[PDB]
Amino acid sequence: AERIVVAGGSLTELIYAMGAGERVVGVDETTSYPPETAKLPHIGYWKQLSSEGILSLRPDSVITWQDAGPQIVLDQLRAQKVNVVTLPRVPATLEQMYANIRQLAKTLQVPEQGDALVTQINQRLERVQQNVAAKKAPVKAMFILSAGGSAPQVAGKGSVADAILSLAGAENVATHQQYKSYSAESLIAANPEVIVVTSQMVDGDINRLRSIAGITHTAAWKNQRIITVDQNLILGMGPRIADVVESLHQQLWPQ
Amino acid sequence: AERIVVAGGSLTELIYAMGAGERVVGVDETTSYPPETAKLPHIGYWKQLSSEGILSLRPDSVITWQDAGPQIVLDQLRAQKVNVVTLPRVPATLEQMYANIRQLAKTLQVPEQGDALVTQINQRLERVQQNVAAKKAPVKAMFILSAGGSAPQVAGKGSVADAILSLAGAENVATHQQYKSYSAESLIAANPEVIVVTSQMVDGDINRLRSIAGITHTAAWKNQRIITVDQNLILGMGPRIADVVESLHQQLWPQ
Numbered sequence: 052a053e054r055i056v057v058a059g060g061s062l063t064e065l066i067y068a069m070g071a072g073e074r075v076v077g078v079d080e081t082t083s084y085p086p087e088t089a090k091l092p093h094i095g096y097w098k099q100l101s102s103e104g105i106l107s108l109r110p111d112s113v114i115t116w117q118d119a120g121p122q123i124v125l126d127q128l129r130a131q132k133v134n135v136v137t138l139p140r141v142p143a144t145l146e147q148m149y150a151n152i153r154q155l156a157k158t159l160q161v162p163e164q165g166d167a168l169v170t171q172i173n174q175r176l177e178r179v180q181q182n183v184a185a186k187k188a189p190v191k192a193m194f195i196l197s198a199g200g201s202a203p204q205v206a207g208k209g210s211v212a213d214a215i216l217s218l219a220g221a222e223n224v225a226t227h228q229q230y231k232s233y234s235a236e237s238l239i240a241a242n243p244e245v246i247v248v249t250s251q252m253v254d255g256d257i258n259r260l261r262s263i264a265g266i267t268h269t270a271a272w273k274n275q276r277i278i279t280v281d282q283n284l285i286l287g288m289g290p291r292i293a294d295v296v297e298s299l300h301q302q303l304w305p306q
Numbered sequence: 307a308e309r310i311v312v313a314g315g316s317l318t319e320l321i322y323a324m325g326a327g328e329r330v331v332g333v334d335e336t337t338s339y340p341p342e343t344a345k346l347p348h349i350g351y352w353k354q355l356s357s358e359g360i361l362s363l364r365p366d367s368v369i370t371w372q373d374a375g376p377q378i379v380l381d382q383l384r385a386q387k388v389n390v391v392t393l394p395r396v397p398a399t400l401e402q403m404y405a406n407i408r409q410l411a412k413t414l415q416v417p418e419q420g421d422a423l424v425t426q427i428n429q430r431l432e433r434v435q436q437n438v439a440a441k442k443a444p445v446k447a448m449f450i451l452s453a454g455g456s457a458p459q460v461a462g463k464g465s466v467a468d469a470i471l472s473l474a475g476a477e478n479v480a481t482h483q484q485y486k487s488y489s490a491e492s493l494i495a496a497n498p499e500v501i502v503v504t505s506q507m508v509d510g511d512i513n514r515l516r517s518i519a520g521i522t523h524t525a526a527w528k529n530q531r532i533i534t535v536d537q538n539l540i541l542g543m544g545p546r547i548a549d550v551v552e553s554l555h556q557q558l559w560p561q
């Protein structure tokens with residue numbers, strides 16, 4: 052409660068957005084915001100957590116996702132009498148995000164800040180839905196991610212990417228669960244009108260995307276409807292969710 | 307006792323294999339080996355150094371790559387009287403690795419250990435080149451990687467992967483410098499006998515690779531000549547190079 056280690060990028064952002072950023076002594080590899088966290092010790096990926104990395108920081112509590120691991124590590128943290136708080140991550144919905152914000156605010160003893168955060172976020176998102184309902188034509192999109200050292204995969208149902216694409220007003224053409232690698236034919240069958248990828252993938256040259264199977268045969272490619280977004284903003288549901296949704300919405304229906 | 311902070315996984319490994327590990331009080335996020343570094347605080351990246359994070363560890367010296375940055379962070383450290391030591395990470399040759407080992411060993415006052423490490427690695431690699439020389443033709447190969455959220459890219463000349471394929475006795479079919487994304491057409495046309503990828507990217511299911519443009523139509527994929535290597539051993543030239551080289555040499559010429 053006094054010294055906190057957070058494993059989960061968007062969780063770290065929520066904690067700082069609620070005014071408890073003071074108690075954070077360690078964060079995970081997926082944490083890259085806000086700026087103040089850059090000087091803090093980072094432990095492994097929330098799925099490849101290091102008990103030693105964490106324990107060396109003498110934390111009072113650890114806050115992370117329920118799908119975070121390895122499991123034995125969490126057992127090791129509890130064994131050292133460390134309070135381990137875990138929150139449901141998927142499937143990603145606004146309802147679950149609001150419940151998580153409130154649970155966190157409860158754990159951090161800052162209930163009023165949690166409620167204000169939920170209110171501010173919902174106001175912004177509803178305004179996007181209003182504007183969305185004012186669009187004359189629907190948009191079939193797809194999100195492709197190359198997170199870490201994996202092959203390119205398409206975001207499906209239950210993913211944060213999918214939740215965000217939907218909030219933005221687009222229809223996700225992918226119907227499978229979570230993330231999966233698509234052969235060129237599958238991507239061509241999906242037939243997305245617009246394709247979203249991370250800025251890290253493009254890194255100044257859309258031609259780098261040519262190694263993604265089937266992408267150049269897509270209508271999105273031919274019609275040059277490829278959008279880029281910072282990966283940290285599309286893989287977690289944090290206090291910057293409205294900003295990303297508004298940005299994406301803008302690129303889906305420009306000018 | 308001297309307090310050292312190392313930025314660059316490869317350098318960290320060299321320093322520990324050199325017997326100067328006890329003096330390290332902090333490392334960066336690219337550092338994941340050896341196991342005893344887990345208790346050390348991992349702050350920043352060598353491409354994105356944290357002035358505040360590093361100074362909070364009260365280091366006497368900081369060791370990193372000549373191109374680590376931002377440059378102004380290095381200036382800050384020196385201004386705070388921290389001895390900053392930098393080594394060239396380019397080119398990825400044995401001659402430069404050995405020179406770096408000796409520069410390190412000198413700076414750390416462990417010249418004998420430095421020379422022993424070079425000798426150990428070299429003899430190991432020479433044995434392999436002896437076996438390779440035996441055959442009359444090197445196996446045509448290619449290495450495909452996905453790092454930092456990039457699309458799949460083929461390793462070209464100058465890359466560490468290229469240096470390791472060569473030492474193992476393979477002929478890198480790629481002729482471009484460093485990494486580039488290949489279209490299905492370019493990948494199929496390169497027509498290598500074998501294709502090396504990381505274990506991280508396969509993660510238990512070869513079908514995950516289906517999203518790499520053209521790999522499914524290569525001779526290597528059909529002949530089932532797809533080898534796996536741990537990504538953590540092909541992005542830097544460290545103490546374990548002989549290990550991955552020998553490991554790979556075995557797969558290029560099974561039995």
Ligand code: HEM
Nearest residue numbers: 059060061062080081198199200201210211212283286287
């Ligand atoms: C090959 C290894 C990796 C795999 C397989 C992987 C996979 C994923 C997946 C599927 C998600 C879920 C996003 C969604 O629901 O749409 C995720 C979240 C995340 N990943 Fe990775 N990832 C890997 C490496 C990394 C690395 C190297 C970073 C870089 C820092 C990174 C940063 C993120 C971030 C920022 C999140 C958000 C977590 C949160 O907000 O709580 N990932 N990753």
